[PDB]
Amino acid sequence: NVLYENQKLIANQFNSAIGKIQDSLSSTPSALGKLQDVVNHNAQALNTLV
Amino acid sequence: QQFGRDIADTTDAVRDPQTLEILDITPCSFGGVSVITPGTNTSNQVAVLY
């Protein structure tokens, strides 16, 4: 019963959170550590062989 | 400058002594060969993947 009495508030908060995370994934440059680290490890291990 | 090099410590650009124009170096077309086959109990034809 708590959802249907607060639907507009939940929708607004959800949209605000979506916009906030869309801005925050681009503002912080160190939020993508793992993928860059694994591709850099692969590149370094390939380069040291040559 | 006599000849160039790259990141991977390999020869890339070579200048001949006869002409001031420089010549690039790219190795011959190399790559693995793979076979695409169905079951030999089923058929006999194969397809070559380069």
Curated annotation (Swiss-Prot), chain B:
Q: Where are the annotated glycans?
A: 41
Q: Which domain of life is it from?
A: Viruses
In UniProt terms, what is the effect of altering residue 8 to D? In strain: Alpha/B.1.1.7
> Tell me, what does this protein do in biology?
Attaches the virion to the cell membrane by interacting with host receptor, initiating the infection. The major receptor is host ACE2. When S2/S2' has been cleaved, binding to the receptor triggers direct fusion at the cell membrane. When S2/S2' has not been cleaved, binding to the receptor results in internalization of the virus by endocytosis using host TFRC and GRM2 and leading to fusion of the virion membrane with the host endosomal membrane. Alternatively, may use NRP1/NRP2 and integrin as entry receptors.
Subunit-level organization = Binds to host ACE2. RBD also interacts with the N-linked glycan on 'Asn-90' of ACE2. Cleavage of S generates a polybasic C-terminal sequence on S1 that binds to host Neuropilin-1 (NRP1) and Neuropilin-2 (NRP2) receptors. Interacts with host integrin alpha-5/beta-1 (ITGA5:ITGB1) and with ACE2 in complex with integrin alpha-5/beta-1 (ITGA5:ITGB1). May interact via cytoplasmic c-terminus with M protein. May interact (via N-terminus) with host bilirubin and biliverdin, thereby preventing antibody binding to the SARS-CoV-2 spike NTD via an allosteric mechanism.
Its protein name is Spike protein S1
The encoding gene is S
User: Covered residues of the complete protein?
Assistant: 563 to 612 of 1273
